Amino acid sequence: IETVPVKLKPGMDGPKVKQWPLTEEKIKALVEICTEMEKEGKISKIGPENPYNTPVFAIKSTKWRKLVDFRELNKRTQDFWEVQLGIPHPAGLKKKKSVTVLDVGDAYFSVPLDEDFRKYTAFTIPSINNETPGIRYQYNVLPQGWKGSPAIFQSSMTKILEPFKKQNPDIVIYQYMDDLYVGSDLEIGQHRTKIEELRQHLLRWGLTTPDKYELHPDKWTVQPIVLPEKDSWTVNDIQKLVGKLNWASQIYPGIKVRQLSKLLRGTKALTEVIPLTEEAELELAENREILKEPVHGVYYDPSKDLIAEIQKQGQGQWTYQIYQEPFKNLKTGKYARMRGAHTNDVKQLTEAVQKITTESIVIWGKTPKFKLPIQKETWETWWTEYWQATWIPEWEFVNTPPLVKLWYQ
């Protein structure tokens, strides 16, 4: 069929990102995948007059998936293609009781890609020890990972889905890149059969989905801060409490601590149990109530970017906050990975970055930029080992630790 013309933003030139070094095992899995794709016409080999490049990786099951990092090309294209060809985000998806994620990325491989645009999709399969120049392909069809793919395929998706949308005016469906998020309110058993319906409706219209993952966004809120509950209080407990409550002042204004600062007037020893005054207890109860209520004036701004901060807490427990301006949390959570010591730190941080991204997609229709507590090179090396998603969020690496660790636990 005739191809949708695609143009870059005026003045923007194609991506030119370097290809990371890969394990031999992964390099072979890629050469195998690509020899099969060139056979089916999805990609073709190119010459040296193609100067652009885009990193490729090998993820996983037992089959090797190929993941193309299209983050750079999306900033140079999808921008004028969330504009010219945007996909609206429903504000009712976060309210449904259950939400299943269906992979429908295989639909793009039939639709051809614009002739003048293919050169910007080039990628390289690296050789070990710089022994050979490297195998270079470009795409002839809509690639997975690119955001212009679901945008171009949008009209076909709406057509294939409308028969199902009529017999289910209550089921919400949203398309982000290669995934279909469908939220219902039915019982879990009902919802699970309604999912197998759509899978069969999609399959009998030509869209296979490798299934033969479900979230619950009704609990997703901004978690309340927790002051310690103690029978007796020492001078140190009151000091950790006065410090944390002094920090909370940056978020909830209206906290009072003068009554709790007087309970430490003299320079007493650290392990000296001090009973709380009558005036003292007024604040520990008055401050535990102003803090169980959400904040005032915190609204999502769609013209800004989302920022996600994670911090390691210990024993496979991680806390995170998603915001846009400091101290204005749109969302805060707590990812815990029960693995019984069959996971490491990098594995847990990877799972969290994906649970946080999936949550962020349902609630706002876009992903946040992560500030990761990890060495840059360490992450740039082992993140593909546990990546199970097809999109890739922007990220950067935190330099200094937080003296505010226990202030989120």
Binding-site residue ranges for Mg(2+): 103, 178-179
The stretch near other proteins (CB under 8 A) out of 55-63, 87-95, 137-145, 265-273 is 265-273
Measured CA to CA, the distance from residue 359 to residue 240 in angstroms comes to: 33
Instruction: Kindly tell me which residue out of 9, 12, 21, 36 binds other proteins, with binding defined by CB under 8 A.
Output: 21
Dihedral of alpha carbons 97, 225, 322, 300, sign: positive
Nearer to other proteins, 149 or 259 (CB): 259
Nearer to other proteins, 232 or 303 (CB): 232
Nearest distance in Å: CB 239, other proteins:
5
Closest CA relative to residue 101, chosen from 197, 183, 220: 183
Q: Determine how many CB atoms are found less than 10 A away from the CB of residue 246.
A: 12
Is 11 a residue that touches other proteins (CB under 8 A)?
Answer: no
Q: Determine how many CB atoms are found less than 10 A away from the CB of residue 180.
A: 22
Measured CA to CA, the distance from residue 103 to residue 211 in angstroms comes to: 8
Instruction: Kindly tell me which residue out of 3, 154, 354, 378 binds other proteins, with binding defined by CB under 8 A.
Output: 378
* Segment (H or E) for 275: none
Residues 270-329 within binding reach of other proteins (CB under 8 A): 270-271, 311-312, 314
Measured CA to CA, the distance from residue 62 to residue 19 in angstroms comes to: 24
Helix ranges (DSSP H) in 67-147:
71-76, 79-83
Nearest distance in Å: CB 70, other proteins:
19
Nearest distance in Å: CB 20, other proteins:
9
Measured CA to CA, the distance from residue 351 to residue 355 in angstroms comes to: 6
3-state secondary structure of 227: coil
Instruction: Kindly tell me which residue out of 39, 166, 204, 265 binds other proteins, with binding defined by CB under 8 A.
Output: 265
**x-marked contacts with other proteins along 135-174 as a string, rule CB under 8 A:** -x--------------------------------------
Which residues lie near other proteins (CB under 8 A)?
21-25, 27, 47-51, 53, 128-133, 136, 234-236, 239, 242-243, 246, 257-258, 261-271, 311-312, 314, 344-346, 348-349, 373-375, 377-378, 381-382, 400-403, 405
